[PDB]
Design a protein around this ligand. Structure first.
Ligand SMILES: OC[C@H]1O[C@@H](O[C@H]2[C@H](O)[C@@H](O)[C@H](O[C@H]3[C@H](O)[C@@H](O)[C@H](O)O[C@@H]3CO)O[C@@H]2CO)[C@H](O)[C@@H](O)[C@@H]1O
Ligand SMILES: OC[C@H]1O[C@@H](O[C@H]2[C@H](O)[C@@H](O)[C@H](O[C@H]3[C@H](O)[C@@H](O)[C@H](O)O[C@@H]3CO)O[C@@H]2CO)[C@H](O)[C@@H](O)[C@@H]1O
Length: 366
């Protein structure tokens, strides 16, 4: 009925329904900050080249072993009225259909506000008043539409807030605005009462980089509703680390265990568990949940695919299990892209009956 953040997160190893409901409107620039409802936008789940989601696809993520699905959702091209941030009824009905598929199959769900560029790209004093008013109206409508779902459904308020093409440390200005987003989100969802009084709410660090929130109280823990304390909130970050493995393909190998295979980044097993410990001390020990809302290693190999895919299996095992035994939930990124380079995070092929074209990832977890 009312699970706490830490209860909800416990043993949750999940999966992202990536590049589906967070696509920009058909034929629109993904960086665009425009709010409206272009014709055809109801079909935007195919705009980036992935299929219409079906029940069978959800069921295959279950059967693989996962127990939660995070659903990224863009809202800005589904707004019937930009002043009030009203949401296209058919878009809501479509989201509920997919959420219902997950819940009917014993999956926990995260729904969020993802690639919402009028919010993510303008964390500045100039746009604060407008972004805050619009975030409130948007979440007022989302929270009210999903008020009657039980606690298996959590809300994450935003995704990666940052100035465009800028992945560095926020300014004081950027931090002030983005922390204000998290507070507004909490206030608005709690003010709809009902099952939202104690629904698991997920808050983000700046650009979902843990290092931009873990120091100096950079990340501000919001004031929740009276008596809730911190027990019904989590801190979310994304953990594509070290970015040299996993991200930009500088190294093909990771860990002291695989030093004999090739060259490895300085960040090893210890730098990871050190960090996880530091997130326990900063946040968990205060009663907050910890959600790793995105992680993964992009499929990339110079020479010896076997040896690289084995090290990837060990990376996936080490990350999931070390997170799990500290009470974190994990959600692996999947964009349904396969190959050898950047942004090759596909696990299942969504065009071929959900066939597992990356068994080495699924060997790492599970
Ligand atoms: O190929 C189809 C479209 O791809 C777009 O890039 C997306 C990537 O495919 C997707 O893997 C990436 O996922 C992000 C995720 O959204 C973010 O929250 C997380 O923290 O990191 C992941 C890895 O970067 O999202 C991007 C969208 O920004 C192209 O931008 C698009 O042109 C193309 O049609
Ligand atoms: O939308 C794709 C864009 O991706 C950019 O790469 C950034 C990643 O999206 C982001 O996840 C990563 O965050 C790293 C951080 O850089 C690193 O210091 C730390 O160790 O881990 C963080 C999370 O794992 O940052 C990179 C950029 O530094 C591309 O740079 C961009 O071209 C592309 O459009």
């Amino acid at each position: 009925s009312n699970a706490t953040a830490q209860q909800w997160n416990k043993d949750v190893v999940g999966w992202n329904l990536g590049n589906e409901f967070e696509c920009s409107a058909p034929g629109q620039d993904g960086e665009s900050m425009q709010i409206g409802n272009p014709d055809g936008s109801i079909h935007a789940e195919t705009a980036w080249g992935n299929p219409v989601v079906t029940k069978k696809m959800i069921q295959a993520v279950k059967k693989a072993g996962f127990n939660a699905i995070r659903i990224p959702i863009r809202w800005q091209c589904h707004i019937t009225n930009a002043q009030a941030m009203s949401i296209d009824k058919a878009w809501i009905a479509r989201i509920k259909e997919v959420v219902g598929w997950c819940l009917d199959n014993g999956l926990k769900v995260i729904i969020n506000v993802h690639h919402e560029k009028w919010l993510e790209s303008r964390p500045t004093y100039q746009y604060k008043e407008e972004n805050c008013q619009k975030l409130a109206l948007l979440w007022m409508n989302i929270a009210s539409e999903f008020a009657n779902y039980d606690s298996r459904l959590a809300f994450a308020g935003t995704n990666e807030v940052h100035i465009r093409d800028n992945w560095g440390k926020p300014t004081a200005e950027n931090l002030e605005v983005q922390n204000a987003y998290n507070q507004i989100f909490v206030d608005v969802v709690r003010a709809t009462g009902g099952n939202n009084a104690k629904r698991h709410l997920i808050l983000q660090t700046y650009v979902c980089n843990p290092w931009f929130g873990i120091e100096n109280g950079d990340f501000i823990i919001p004031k929740d509703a009276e008596g809730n304390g911190n027990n019904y909130m989590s801190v979310e970050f994304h953990y594509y680390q070290p970015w040299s493995y996993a991200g930009d393909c500088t190294y093909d190998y990771w860990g002291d265990a695989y030093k004999d295979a090739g060259k490895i980044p300085a960040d090893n097993e210890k730098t990871m568990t050190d960090f996880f410990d530091k997130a326990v001390n900063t946040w968990s020990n205060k009663g907050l949940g910890i959600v790793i809302g995105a992680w993964g290693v992009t499929d990339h190999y110079k020479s010896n695919s076997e040896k690289v895919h084995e090290n990837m299996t060990y990376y996936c095992k080490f990350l999931t299990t070390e997170a799990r035994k500290r009470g974190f939930s994990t959600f692996v990124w999947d964009n349904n892209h396969f190959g050898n380079g950047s942004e090759k995070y596909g696990i299942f092929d969504r065009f071929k009956s959900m066939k597992v074209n990356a068994p080495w990832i699924l060997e790492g977890i599970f």
